[PDB]
Amino acid sequence: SGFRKMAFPSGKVEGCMVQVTCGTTTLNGLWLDDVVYCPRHVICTSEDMLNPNYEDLLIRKSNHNFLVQAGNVQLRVIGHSMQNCVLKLKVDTANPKTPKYKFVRIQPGQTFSVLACYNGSPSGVYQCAMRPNFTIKGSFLNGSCGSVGFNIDYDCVSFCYMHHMELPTGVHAGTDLEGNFYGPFVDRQTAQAAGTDTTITVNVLAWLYAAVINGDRWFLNRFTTTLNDFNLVAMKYNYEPLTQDHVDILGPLSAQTGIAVLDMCASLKELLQNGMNGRTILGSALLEDEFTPFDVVRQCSGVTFQ
């Protein structure tokens, strides 16, 4: 029993974090085999951030311009290349702590753990979702760029996020591990803004199932609804449209609790129309949307990693 915003164990990723210094700029890097991945704006100076041409900035650098430190050990850079907005520093030593891993670009709505890091040293771990507007609501200070987001499946670390910048509303923007930003953002310090966000409907529904699995039924009702009539109310409350795909994904949770997906939708509709009336669900007074259907099954059933 109980339900918490749970992150994956972070040890496999802690063994990969390093410090990268070039010029006056220091940030975090990810050391896998003999390559260190980090944000390309590490080559920018205090006047290079307004509108840089990174190809032209990179051709002017030598390998010895990059200081890479793993613990109290200098790593030696023997090559470099730019891929999109990430820089790849080839070093002469393979990381002995390299886990099994993949690079994956996730869809909005999916969740991951963030290992926040400063100067190559892990600071803390928390769970995030990619919002529909391709920002993440993180917790990041100066010097956190290069920290990564990840999922773990059995023994394999699927890296999905590298942190780059903060936007004026206090939300955060970054790339996949191949240097492609999530969303329309670019790595220069010109005016950019998040864009309007929406609530991740399928996730709110998964979390209502988590509540039922854990003992709450107070929000259920005897009604049902059709997908279209649901989506009509969802649109009004700035919720994402629920697709037939989302319905099928909620299949296992529906079958374990015996509440049909559209019946749970009728419950959400009533919660949206009437509020929660001073009641809470799983310790929350808001409809929570940063648990996927997979997250709920994982935590309400006990899946481990090795």
Ligand X SMILES: *CC(=O)[C@H](C[C@@H]1CCNC1=O)NC(=O)[C@H](CC1CCCCC1)NC(=O)[C@@H](NC(=O)OCc1ccccc1)[C@@H](C)OC(C)(C)C
Helices (H), 215-301: 227-236, 244-249, 251-257, 261-274, 293-301
Pick the piece of the chain touching ligand X (CB under 6 A) from 56-64, 159-167, 216-224, 227-235.
159-167
* Residue 8 interacting with a second copy (CB under 8 A): yes
Active-site annotation holder among 16, 22, 38, 41 = 41
Least gap, CB of 1 to a second copy (angstroms): 4
Active-site annotation holder among 16, 38, 85, 145 = 145
Give the whole-angstrom CA distance, residue 80 versus residue 186: 21
* Residue 131 interacting with ligand X (CB under 6 A): no
* Residue 20 interacting with ligand X (CB under 6 A): no
Closest CA to 65 of 84, 47, 42: 42
193: left (phi over 0), alpha (psi -120 to 50) or beta: beta
Near a second copy in 118-137, by CB under 8 A: 118-119, 121-126, 128, 137
Half-sphere exposure of 53 (CA within 13 A, CB side): 4
Say which DSSP state 239 is in.
Answer: B
145 binds, among ligand X, a second copy, none (CB under 5 to 8 A by kind): ligand X
Who's near 212: CB < 8 A, 6+ residues apart? Answer: 220, 257, 259
Is there a catalytic annotation at residue 16? Answer: no
> What is the token pair recorded at 242?
């629920």
Is there a catalytic annotation at residue 246? Answer: no
* Residue 44 interacting with ligand X (CB under 6 A): yes
When binding is defined by CB under 6 A, the residue of 24, 62, 73, 191 that contacts ligand X is 191
Give the whole-angstrom CA distance, residue 240 versus residue 242: 6
When binding is defined by CB under 8 A, the residue of 40, 172, 246, 269 that contacts a second copy is 172
Annotated catalytic residues are 41, 145
Binding site for a second copy (CB under 8 A): 1-12, 14-15, 115-119, 121-126, 128, 137-144, 166, 170-172, 214-215, 280, 283-286, 298-306
